[PDB]
C-alpha cells in the first residue's frame, strides 16, 4: 500500500534523526566507556547484576535494522546505558562519573531531539 511506503518513509527519517543524535551522544564518551557491551569473559557475574545491559554498538545495531519506533525507546535504551553502570560501579569510579557526565551532557541534545520529533512529526 501507499500508506505501508509513506509509515516506512517516516521510520526511515527517524533513523536518520536517530543516527545523527547516537553520533552527538557517543561524542560526549570520548573515553569510550560505554561504546561495547561490557565483557562476560572480564566480569563474568555481570547479569547476576544488570539484568539488561546496554552499551552504544548494541544500540547502533538495533538503529540500522530501524529497530527504534519512536524517540521514546532509544532513549529508554540510552538511560539503560547510564543506570547499569550508576548501580554497577560505586560513586568514586572513573566509570560512574563517566555516566553522570554523559547523562549530563547528552540531556541537552535530548532536549533538542525531542523538539524536532514533534515538529517534523
Given at each position: 500500500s501507499m500508506?505501508?511506503?509513506?509509515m516506512e518513509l517516516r521510520l526511515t527519517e527517524l533513523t536518520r534523526l536517530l543516527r545523527s543524535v547516537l553520533d552527538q551522544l557517543q561524542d560526549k564518551d570520548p573515553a569510550r566507556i560505554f561504546a561495547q557491551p561490557v565483557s562476560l569473559k572480564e566480569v563474568p557475574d555481570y547479569l547476576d547484576?544488570?539484568?539488561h545491559p546496554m552499551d552504544f554498538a548494541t544500540m547502533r545495531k538495533r538503529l540500522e535494522a530501524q529497530?527504534?519506533?519512536?524517540?521514546?525507546?532509544?532513549?529508554?535504551d540510552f538511560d539503560l546505558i547510564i543506570d547499569?553502570?550508576?548501580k554497577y560501579n560505586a560513586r568514586d569510579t572513573?566509570?560512574?562519573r563517566a555516566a553522570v557526565r554523559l547523562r549530563d551532557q547528552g540531556g541537552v541534545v535530548l532536549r533538542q531531539a525531542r523538539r524536532e520529533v514533534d515538529s517534523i512529526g
Open positions: 500508506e505501508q511506503v509513506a547484576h544488570i539484568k529497530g527504534y519506533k519512536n524517540l521514546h525507546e532509544f532513549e529508554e547499569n553502570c550508576m572513573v566509570f560512574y
